[PDB]
Structure 1
Amino acid sequence: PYDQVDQLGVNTLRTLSIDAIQRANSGHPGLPMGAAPMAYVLWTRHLKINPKTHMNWVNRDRFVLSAGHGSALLYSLAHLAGYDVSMDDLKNFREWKSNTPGHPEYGCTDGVEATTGPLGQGISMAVGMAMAEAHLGKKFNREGYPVMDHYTYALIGDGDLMEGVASEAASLAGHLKLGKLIALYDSNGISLDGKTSASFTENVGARFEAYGWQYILVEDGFNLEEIDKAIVQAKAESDKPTIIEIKTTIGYGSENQGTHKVHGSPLGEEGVAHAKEVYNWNYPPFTVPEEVSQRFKECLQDKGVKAENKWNEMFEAYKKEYSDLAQKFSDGFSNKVPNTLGDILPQYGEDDSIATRAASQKAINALAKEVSSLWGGAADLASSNKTVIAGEGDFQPESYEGRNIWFGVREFGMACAMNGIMLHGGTRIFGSTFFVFSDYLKAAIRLSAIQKLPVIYVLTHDSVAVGKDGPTHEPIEQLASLRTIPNVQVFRPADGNETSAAWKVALETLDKPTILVLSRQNLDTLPISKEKVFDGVEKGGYVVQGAENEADGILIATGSEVGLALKAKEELQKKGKDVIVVSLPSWERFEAQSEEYKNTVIPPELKKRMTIEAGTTYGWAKYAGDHGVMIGIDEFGMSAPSDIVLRELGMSVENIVDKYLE
């Protein structure tokens, strides 16, 4: 099974990682040193990948380093395995423009499946990848045609297991019985500040068992043979996901091994030498020994090529027997969308009154028949958010084809799962909760943005118009929270047509997440054509009603406040004041337009402006100008009837009119 060359492999990982860190004079040597043994066994015997085709083989096993600080080990693996990470790349760890950055960045480095610096999120994404494999397998697989059949692995440490979000992900994964998911827990009794037993002395195996996982202990984590065995039993147990606790010694080889001092700093030239002693390692820095290159070739590369070719062959047969199906399987992965979205989506007449959450629910159902790769759910708020895909089944172990995911009351875990689902490929995902609770998943939105994933977030109950549930349930600052996240687009639709148009844009946008911000209360339909609303929303902002002749002023608004501005336009047309009304459903989309376009919507030279949005005024001075007035809410709300809360916080016609006139 395992012989002496293999140990020289383990130690090649150790040394590369440590040399990389030492040359950068920056990085985290402890995990590489304690976890090379486990990573070696996995990558050489148990990872079904083919580096020769980079990350394009859709049925490769997926590996995630959730303990993202172990990056130097991941790169050393990617290099040994044959990905486009060269020795020179390892020598540029943490250097400007390198493909070997401080924490792993998906899209930056060949072989890196996920961006994982932030703790907890790596494993919770892996859970999403595993849900996707299960979903797709059940939808597409057939007698003799295992088209979506693979494992999901996550390497995790104590930090991951302390984070709430990894609890939410593990509970959800246990309930969904994701038997193809396996976690390798590098259990070394050390976190950054010191002994883990200063804060974390819980029984991890038992918790995991309480979730419906399988727990396996490997007491000797430098025993390659035992790790292999544990992974084999993890695989045989396909009714349950499995966590393998692997007892290791952090910083193995340093005088400081087993202490916090090896967690987050280079060893220094002395400590690198001392570890090389203990390893009986005599090679110069940044050398791979020949027998190690050859063992990886043997174990990993050649096996990978043959499994991909046997999958390509099996696949060509699939596509001939089950033609229409395999075409959908391909369209899933390539994100094909129909040209008729504009016709498929619901349209609203000038008399319609509908809440944007309900108009979103109607888009979802109209879309589900035509975009067959679309699935999603709510964080135990499908009935409140309105995010049931009617008659399309529930995603459960006995029905992995069901398209309605029941995330439970797990906002952050939901978001991270959606990231994994999208890293996996093959579907379009959406997830809903209340906008005020976007604070709970904000760090995952951040990761959607970094990783450029077109996750769709459906955030309902968007303002103090929520009413009786009171301040904790009434958003104020959450638009500012999400608009500021780079590489996102936030749409706050003003009626049902804007809401349909926002969903179309969300389907057509493939390199950033789209966030839809939706009302609880009914809103009137804007008095202009479908054609113009769709154009305007595709552009992020547009004129809803111009001035007959020369404009006295301009009202710029979003969401539910656009109807308010339309009313204030009427009241003001009396008093002798003819104002423009602009809807600005997305700041980000609006600013990506030409200066020419933007000038047509907000006249650079017109200076009597009012901005109106039920949320903080922070940021609005940009459109309001030195001379403008900002109507907004910069205080917590209250528990009262909707109309009273709005009136009292100044989201009224009378207030907008008075403020424009004073």
Structure 2
Amino acid sequence: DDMQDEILNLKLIANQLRQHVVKMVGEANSGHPGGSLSAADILAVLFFKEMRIDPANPKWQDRDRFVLSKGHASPVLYAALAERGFFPKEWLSQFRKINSPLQGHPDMKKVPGVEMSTGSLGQGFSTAVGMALGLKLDRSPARVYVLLGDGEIQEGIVWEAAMAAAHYKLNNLTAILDYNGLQIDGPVQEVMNPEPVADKWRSFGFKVITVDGHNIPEIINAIDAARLHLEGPTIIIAKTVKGKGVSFMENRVEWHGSAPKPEQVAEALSELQVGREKLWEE
């Protein structure tokens, strides 16, 4: 089975992205493990199966584009781009250091494969709408993929951008929501409840597909359904576990923006390596 082997390989790549996230945040003493780990299966599917991209031609005009609108999750994007060959893996060890290209939030002028400088929440999504608008005008076959946080959708610019994407019929824009239920000050339902989230996106003119964001076949199937929907954009609402893959980080508000100490990096890598050895058994 090449399809079954394809899925196993994507699970192994997702595990590698998680190991990079834990190590690079530990070494930096700074960064955002929870919302990086929640998105690792989504970025494995995008960067290693679904996106048309070439690290030997990073300015290819018809390339698919990924925008990390929740830019604090830069570790998982940098892990994906390093594993795809956009820049040396050695860069990951200088994350958040002075003079390093790997800034705490992505800088499109310093990192090959970064399509927008993000880090101010809501702004990446608005720029993704502009990219999709221009590519639609240029008859490009390109698709624009954009990852949002579920705290991030409290920003007014997200709803402006959604209204505009529906009005301009941007069926070349696929939004993905990292639906992990947590933000800095607590659960999103306690801080500023955005529910009913699927009803809001449908009322703004998006097709909505709900998936388990840790189920690689469901993510693949949702991206195929988005491609076939021509009336306008689609959002994939991906139910995820913040800190997915590390027992002591899973569903924990406090692992949003805290760096693990060396003993916690060792514990997290041991869990992920036990997970990886079990995949090599398949």
Do both share a fold (TM > 0.5)? yes
Which amino acid in the other structure matches residue 151 of structure 2?
Answer: G
Counterparts of 1:123-142 in structure 2 under 5 Å? Answer: 123-137=125-139
Distance in structure 2 (CA, Å) of the matches to 1:130 and 1:41 = 20
Match in the other structure for 2:166: 174
Alpha-carbon shift at residue 132 of structure 1 (Å): 0.5
Alpha-carbon shift at residue 177 of structure 1 (Å): 1.4
Which of 229, 232, 235 is the aligned partner of 2:224?
A: 232
Distance in structure 2 (CA, Å) of the matches to 1:3 and 1:134 = 31
Distance in structure 2 (CA, Å) of the matches to 1:281 and 1:12 = 12
SS of alignment partner, residue 110 of structure 1: coil
SS of alignment partner, residue 76 of structure 2: helix
Which amino acid in the other structure matches residue 242 of structure 1?
Answer: T
Alpha-carbon shift at residue 181 of structure 1 (Å): 0.3
Residue 32 (1) aligns with residue 24 (2): no
Which of 169, 189, 209 is the aligned partner of 1:216?
A: 209
Residue 195 (1) aligns with residue 199 (2): no
CA contact (8 A) 1:17 1:76 kept: yes
Match in the other structure for 2:68: 65
Match in the other structure for 2:113: 111
Greater length-normalized contact order (CA 8 Å, ≥ 6 residues apart): 2
Alpha-carbon shift at residue 249 of structure 1 (Å): 0.3
Alpha-carbon shift at residue 256 of structure 1 (Å): 3.1
String of CA shifts for 1:385-412, please: whole Å, max 9, x gaps. xxxxxxxxxxxxxxxxxxxxxxxxxxxx
Distance in structure 2 (CA, Å) of the matches to 1:25 and 1:38 = 25
Which of 255, 258, 264 is the aligned partner of 1:265?
A: 258
Which of 186, 198, 205 is the aligned partner of 1:205?
A: 198
Residue 20 (1) aligns with residue 24 (2): yes
CA contact (8 A) 2:144 2:172 kept: yes
Match in the other structure for 1:511: none
SS of alignment partner, residue 22 of structure 2: helix
Give the share of equivalent positions with the same residue, in percent. Answer: 38
Counterparts of 1:357-436 in structure 2 under 5 Å? Answer: none
Which amino acid in the other structure matches residue 8 of structure 2?
Answer: Q
Residue 102 (1) aligns with residue 104 (2): yes
Distance in structure 1 (CA, Å) of the matches to 2:14 and 2:253 = 22
Which amino acid in the other structure matches residue 80 of structure 2?
Answer: L
Which amino acid in the other structure matches residue 75 of structure 2?
Answer: A
Alpha-carbon shift at residue 281 of structure 1 (Å): 4.2
String of CA shifts for 1:462-482, please: whole Å, max 9, x gaps. xxxxxxxxxxxxxxxxxxxxx
CA contact (8 A) 2:29 2:260 kept: no
String of CA shifts for 1:26-73, please: whole Å, max 9, x gaps. 10001221110011011111101111112x211111110000001111
Structure 1 residues 254, 269: closer, same or farther in 2, change over 3 A? farther
Residue 164 (1) aligns with residue 156 (2): yes
Which amino acid in the other structure matches residue 251 of structure 1?
Answer: G
Structure 1 stretches lacking a partner, 5+ long: 138-147, 284-290, 292-662
Match in the other structure for 1:80: 83
Alpha-carbon shift at residue 9 of structure 1 (Å): 0.9
CA contact (8 A) 2:153 2:194 kept: no
Alpha-carbon shift at residue 184 of structure 1 (Å): 1.1
CA contact (8 A) 1:194 1:259 kept: no
Alpha-carbon shift at residue 175 of structure 1 (Å): 1.5
CA contact (8 A) 1:254 1:271 kept: no
Paired residue total: 271
Which amino acid in the other structure matches residue 182 of structure 2?
Answer: I
Distance in structure 2 (CA, Å) of the matches to 1:97 and 1:152 = 30
Which amino acid in the other structure matches residue 195 of structure 1?
Answer: P
Which amino acid in the other structure matches residue 22 of structure 2?
Answer: I
Match in the other structure for 1:45: 49
CA contact (8 A) 1:276 1:282 kept: no
Give the ranges of 4+ consecutive aligned residues of structure 1 lying more than 2 Å apart after TM superposition. 1-6, 267-283
Which amino acid in the other structure matches residue 193 of structure 2?
Answer: F
TM-score, normalised with respect to structure 2: 0.92
CA contact (8 A) 1:177 1:212 kept: no
Match in the other structure for 1:584: none
Alpha-carbon shift at residue 269 of structure 1 (Å): 2.5
Structure 2 stretches lacking a partner, 5+ long: none
Q: Which has the larger radius of gyration?
A: 1
Which amino acid in the other structure matches residue 44 of structure 1?
Answer: F
Match in the other structure for 2:10: 6
SS of alignment partner, residue 111 of structure 1: coil
Distance in structure 2 (CA, Å) of the matches to 1:19 and 1:256 = 14
Which amino acid in the other structure matches residue 267 of structure 2?
Answer: H
Distance in structure 2 (CA, Å) of the matches to 1:149 and 1:7 = 28
String of CA shifts for 1:187-207, please: whole Å, max 9, x gaps. 000001111111224211111
SS of alignment partner, residue 41 of structure 2: helix
Distance in structure 1 (CA, Å) of the matches to 2:141 and 2:62 = 7
Counterparts of 1:541-580 in structure 2 under 5 Å? Answer: none
Distance in structure 2 (CA, Å) of the matches to 1:97 and 1:254 = 34
String of CA shifts for 1:316-370, please: whole Å, max 9, x gaps. xxxxxxxxxxxxxxxxxxxxxxxxxxxxxxxxxxxxxxxxxxxxxxxxxxxxxxx
Match in the other structure for 1:256: 249
Counterparts of 1:195-594 in structure 2 under 5 Å? Answer: 195-198=187-190, 199-218=192-211, 220-252=212-244, 253-281=246-274
Alpha-carbon shift at residue 3 of structure 1 (Å): 3.5
More displaced 10-residue stretch of structure 1: 169-178 or 274-283: 274-283
Aligned Cα root-mean-square deviation (Å): 1.6
Distance in structure 2 (CA, Å) of the matches to 1:160 and 1:124 = 12
Alpha-carbon shift at residue 117 of structure 1 (Å): 0.7
Which of 122, 125, 132 is the aligned partner of 2:124?
A: 122
Distance in structure 2 (CA, Å) of the matches to 1:88 and 1:254 = 27
Distance in structure 2 (CA, Å) of the matches to 1:272 and 1:184 = 29
SS of alignment partner, residue 77 of structure 1: helix
Alpha-carbon shift at residue 282 of structure 1 (Å): 8.6
CA contact (8 A) 2:151 2:182 kept: no
